[PDB]
Amino acid sequence: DDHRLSNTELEQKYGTNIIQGLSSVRATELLARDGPNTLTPPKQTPEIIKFLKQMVGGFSILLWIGAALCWIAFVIQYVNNSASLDNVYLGAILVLVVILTGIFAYYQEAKSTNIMASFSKMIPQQALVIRDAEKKVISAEQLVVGDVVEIKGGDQIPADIRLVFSQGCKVDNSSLTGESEPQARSTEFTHENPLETKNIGFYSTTCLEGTATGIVINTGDRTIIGRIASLASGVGSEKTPIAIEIEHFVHIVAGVAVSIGIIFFITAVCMKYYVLDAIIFLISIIVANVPEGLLATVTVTLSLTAKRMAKKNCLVKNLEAVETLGSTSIICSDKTGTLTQNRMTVAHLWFDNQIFVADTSENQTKQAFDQSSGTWASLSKIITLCNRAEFRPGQESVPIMKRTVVGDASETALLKFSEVILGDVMGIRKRNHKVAEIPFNSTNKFQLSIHETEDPNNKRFLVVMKGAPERILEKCSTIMINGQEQPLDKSSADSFHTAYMELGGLGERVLGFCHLYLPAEQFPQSYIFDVDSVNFPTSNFCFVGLLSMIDPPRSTVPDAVSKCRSAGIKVIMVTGDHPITAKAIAKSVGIISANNETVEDIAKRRNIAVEQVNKREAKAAVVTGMELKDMTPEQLDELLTNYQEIVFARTSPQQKLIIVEGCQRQDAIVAVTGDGVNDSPALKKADIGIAMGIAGSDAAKNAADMVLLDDNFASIVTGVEEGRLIFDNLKKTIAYTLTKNIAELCPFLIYIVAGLPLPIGTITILFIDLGTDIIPSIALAYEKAESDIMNRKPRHKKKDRLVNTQLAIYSYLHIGLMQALGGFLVYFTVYAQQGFWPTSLINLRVAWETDDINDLEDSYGQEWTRYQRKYLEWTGSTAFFVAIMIQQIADLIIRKTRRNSIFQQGLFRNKVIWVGIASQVIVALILSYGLGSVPALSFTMLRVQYWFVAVPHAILIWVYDEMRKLFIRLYPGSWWDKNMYY
Amino acid sequence: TGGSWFKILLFYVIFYGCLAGIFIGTIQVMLLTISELKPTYQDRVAPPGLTQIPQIQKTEISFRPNDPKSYEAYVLNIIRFLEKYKDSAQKDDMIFEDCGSMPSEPKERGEFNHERGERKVCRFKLDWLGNCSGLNDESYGYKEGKPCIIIKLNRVLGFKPKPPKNYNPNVLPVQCTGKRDEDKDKVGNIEYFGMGGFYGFPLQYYPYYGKLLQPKYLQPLLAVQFTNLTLDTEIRIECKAYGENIGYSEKDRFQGRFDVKIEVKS
Ligand SMILES: CCCCCCCC/C=C/CCCCCCCC(=O)OC[C@H](COP(=O)(O)OCC[N+](C)(C)C)OC(=O)CCCCCCC/C=C/CCCCCCCC
Ligand SMILES: CCCCCCCC/C=C\CCCCCCCC(=O)OC[C@H](COP(=O)(O)OCC[N+](C)(C)C)OC(=O)CCCCCCC/C=C/CCCCCCCC
Ligand SMILES: CCCCCCCC/C=C\CCCCCCCC(=O)OC[C@H](COP(=O)(O)OCC[N+](C)(C)C)OC(=O)CCCCCCC/C=C\CCCCCCCC
Ligand SMILES: CC(C)CCC[C@@H](C)[C@H]1CC[C@H]2[C@@H]3CC=C4C[C@@H](O)CC[C@]4(C)[C@H]3CC[C@]12C
Ligand SMILES: CC(C)CCC[C@@H](C)[C@H]1CC[C@H]2[C@@H]3CC=C4C[C@@H](O)CC[C@]4(C)[C@H]3CC[C@]12C
């Protein structure tokens, strides 16, 4: 590519001259040929289209057909004069139900975002360009490929450039790798990968220091960050697992309704019925079979869970995301900033031929390693005195490990360590006056400083130095042990060797510390020192100790990873960092278990080649981006299947998305946790994307469904448990709402095939739907767990449906039929007590509904007018409604557990259940005596006994469910358990 | 799944049989409290309805006297209703009893108990119907533009009508008038023919004891002729029954009264 060509070959490929630059005519010609250097925003669907698409989703199509049938029935009832005006009310109610359900669905759907709007504060506004041999400041959107540009420290790179001249250039590629470590830039081809080359500057990255000259090679959306933004905006338009479950349930219910309607229309037309009776029956079938308030209730429950979880500092941007955590089987986690603190801290110390462990917590105020006061006073003096980093003004009451510091990352770590241990660092530095200073440079690889001791007894010169361990040792001749000096030998130059490699094998950068006390005779009190490495000695120092630093894990991360793994979830580390640090962090956070080894650990422990060790003896894998680049999708599938612990290191955003897609190809729901720009494509592609609040970037937070506002990884476990409870309570809610459908449907079937006077009206059952069990349906969402919910395994996405055959069968063919029989008992009781015995009602419907017959004779010989028959029909309808309510109370009681008893779970523990029961009773009372005092909507005032006729049937329902669950508990895995447990 | 099909089918057969048995048992338990002699309640039926004969559609009586096919349905309905009031149909002296030809007090035939046997029934003579009995005029006033209607009070078990206080204390009065001031002048001269020359229902035909204690029961009748209907116009007539026991409603247009619209064309 462009990083392999020379300056001359670059000047021919792009038709440019480094000294002169592009002309002002060719610049405009190329701006016309290629376009501006800007990122094109994605094309978003209009909001009104999204809102209108929700009027045909769910059960709305069936309800639209029902409203159309209502209108076609009213036109027929108007052609043949019939003063009904009842189908218009039903059609209007159905349309209103469709509109409200569509509004709820629109509020539930995922919000649209343009992540490219977060690629804004990184994009530079202006660019210093060389055109016509004259440097001018143009806008970065006018840059064209082949243009020569200048970049300085504290500058955003205006485009993807190939550096042709560079002088001490360092950049920040955290938008590419997630790592904030400064990267040295040069003009020489260093590595084959363009993303690791040292001679390419990347669009929208920060030039930390130095100056460079480069030729523009990519512009606009053709850049690396432009491709990242395009990839993020493209992927991630799929449906959540909870949406797929709801769609499957809707398909089941709609298929049942359509089959019943077709069968009972085809048979009804062949039963000597005419069009009006065949279409009103179809309307009744549609209204009874469709749960008209269930989807809005689901949206309400999702909103309630999201509001509850927002109180634990967990922002949920998409309503459906509250469930995805809970069915997730794989978590792909970014390392830096997500699993770690994104702050370099002192991890280990090696002095006195001992290795010490330092506290790496974010909120720490003391260090508990053994401070022997021998060699430790010297080590602390070197740490405090040989540092240039200082805190920033305005930070005094801030915790030490939270204050902002100007200086290098390694120097910031040492400064915070010294401030934590010693308390006073600036004062100590002020007391020991600094009279000489050789600053740190990459060439020297050390930092020197000459000080004056704060001991009036001595008042000597103390020259301290820190640097690379090997450079420090080769500049050292004596070591300090237990507070006493000691000449070097092979015994102390090999202990140092082993300690250096032990610390460096943990992914930590080691620093060597040494000092020297200058004699008072050959270095008197004045002795002005020359920083030219002439006046003072720079050898034969006294080694003191080694310090290593790491970006450590967050305090709550290892426990959260352990709990997630105990919940049956696979945790994969996908990072852009180097494999040595990534493996160590994975072992620290528990991603790689202590016993488990990689294929190279066994080779090292067996002193053989890596091809001798079988790949089946290893339980962990560390795969780099270059290993993954040469991997076939079948190879990736085999790697994911064969290993439970995998670390992916040094990966690009494209490779992160590839890993997420490979995990998804195994029929798995994948969660991705990240906090950087490079995580946005994977956060978008994942089933649920979780971003960090404080540590996260805007691009990551826009691409995520969930944001951890306090950067607490323990919120993941709480979210998994909440989602697992939602999935279990939604089954109970769906079963409860599906039970009443058959109790509403059976009266119409009996009315059509047996000719009974209409047991219940179509308007009446809508009150059961939308007014009576809305609050009970919501109340079933507050149920607690029956067993240890976190001790299970993740549900199979293709095998564990929300609504299965067992749930539908138990709701339709078991409890719904019982409720229908209980209601028919009250129907017959109401009719028989006025004069119509149950046998006399058969085939009575035609004469019952004749307006011209006003002397219909009952079982006693009494003659009835049409209006009194209408009133008795309304009374029977109200009694049927009340019976359905009373039996749905018992249905609510029994549907609150799936395996446990009401005695084991507790009857009054969930108070929302009793709120729902009270709401049922109050709504029924208002309908019966409010709309019954003035007979309206087929409601009349009932007698007292009609509220209690159906109580024994409800008791029978409760008894049957209790016995079924008891025998499920008694014999697990038996014939009863397999066939009767839903 | 092979053998477990038998087990699941057996479970479902037993479960549905038990459900059906429980439903049937509840129905029997409820019906044990239901008497076969008198209804438990009379909330809907107790204020009786007033109904006319012939049975018509949309309450309209419309015919042309010169065309016999315009009133054939009306005449057939009247014949079908009155066929049970024939003198030959009430000859059984063990079933029918000859109560007085003058209005009297209600006849208490005992109590609503299976004892005492079947209750006897008063006879109603077709000759009392008058110009509307079919004995002489086989068209019941039709064919001449003078239609007859027969008013009946809906049967209620144990119901004893109470005529309003003052004239005849043993007749429940009935009157037919034009509905509006437009119909009150074109209706003509209403002719009533009741038992004994009284316009209403004699009280000795009450109370009714039911279809099981009192089969072959004959409720009293009141024929009404018009004889002066304005031709080629639609006259709206309201027939109302009066009594302390008799009530009316605005929702039930057939409770204690009814509407009939009669148009005799030319
Ligand atoms: C006295 C009067 C008696 C009247 C009786 C009338 C006959 C009715 C009988 C129906 C025959 C059996 C119907 C079901 C047959 C099996 C269908 C099936 O196996 O389907 C294929 C798969 C099965 O996998 P799964 O979803 O179970 O596993 C989910 C995963 N897990 C379990 C882990 C959650 O599922 C799918 O593809 C989706 C299909 C699942 C739902 C199927 C429909 C169930 C509904 C039944 C109601 C029928 C009656 C309606 C009301 C009538 C009123 C009188
Ligand atoms: C209102 C009062 C209601 C009272 C009834 C409530 C219903 C529930 C109560 C009792 C139902 C029967 C007892 C429970 C089921 C049998 C339990 C049992 O003994 O173990 C299951 C057996 C054999 O299991 P296995 O050896 O294969 O397991 C091996 C397991 N491993 C492999 C792990 C070793 O399987 C079998 O025998 C299955 C044999 C066939 C089962 C159905 C037969 C007919 C049952 C009807 C009950 C419902 C009647 C109607 C109720 C109407 C209420 C209104
Ligand atoms: C789920 C498992 C199946 C559940 C249903 C099983 C089938 C039940 C259907 C018919 C059997 C009814 C038999 C009940 C016992 C009656 C025995 C009897 O002596 O017989 C006569 C009775 C009527 O006596 P009476 O008043 O003239 O007494 C006169 C004197 N007294 C008033 C003074 C005392 O006959 C009567 O009971 C009236 C019969 C009217 C039939 C209507 C059928 C529809 C009504 C309810 C069925 C609901 C099913 C829901 C699910 C359908 C599938 C989706
Ligand atoms: C008594 C009669 C009506 C019983 C008829 C059973 C009918 C209503 C039930 C039983 C099995 C059901 C089917 C089971 C499987 C599927 C596949 C799913 O992707 C759409 C729904 C659909 C197609 C269901 C439609 C309704 C269905 C066919
Ligand atoms: C009229 C009555 C007797 C018939 C009622 C149906 C009963 C007897 C039987 C007939 C066939 C049965 C189904 C056959 C197979 C399956 C598939 C399985 O994955 C779940 C249970 C389920 C869905 C059964 C449920 C019970 C069932 C529906």
Ligand SMILES: Nc1ncnc2c1ncn2[C@@H]1O[C@H](COP(=O)(O)OP(=O)(O)O)[C@@H](O)[C@H]1O
């Ligand atoms: N104050 C210091 N800050 C950072 N590194 C230092 C310092 N003093 C000495 N060193 C040593 O210099 C080495 C080289 O640093 P540098 O060239 O900036 O980067 P790199 O370590 O990536 O090559 C470090 O790895 C460290 O051992």
Ligand SMILES: *[C@@H]1O[C@H](CO)[C@@H](O)[C@H](O)[C@H]1NC(C)=O
């Ligand atoms: C009606 O009855 C009177 C009684 O005298 C009789 O004279 C007259 O002919 C009858 N008219 C009709 C319409 O039959």
Ligand code: ALF
């Ligand atoms: F923070 Al990363 F890959 F470790 F984006």
Ligand SMILES: [Mg+2]
């Ligand atoms: Mg990160």
Ligand code: NA
């Ligand atoms: Na419904």
Ligand code: NA
């Ligand atoms: Na997502």
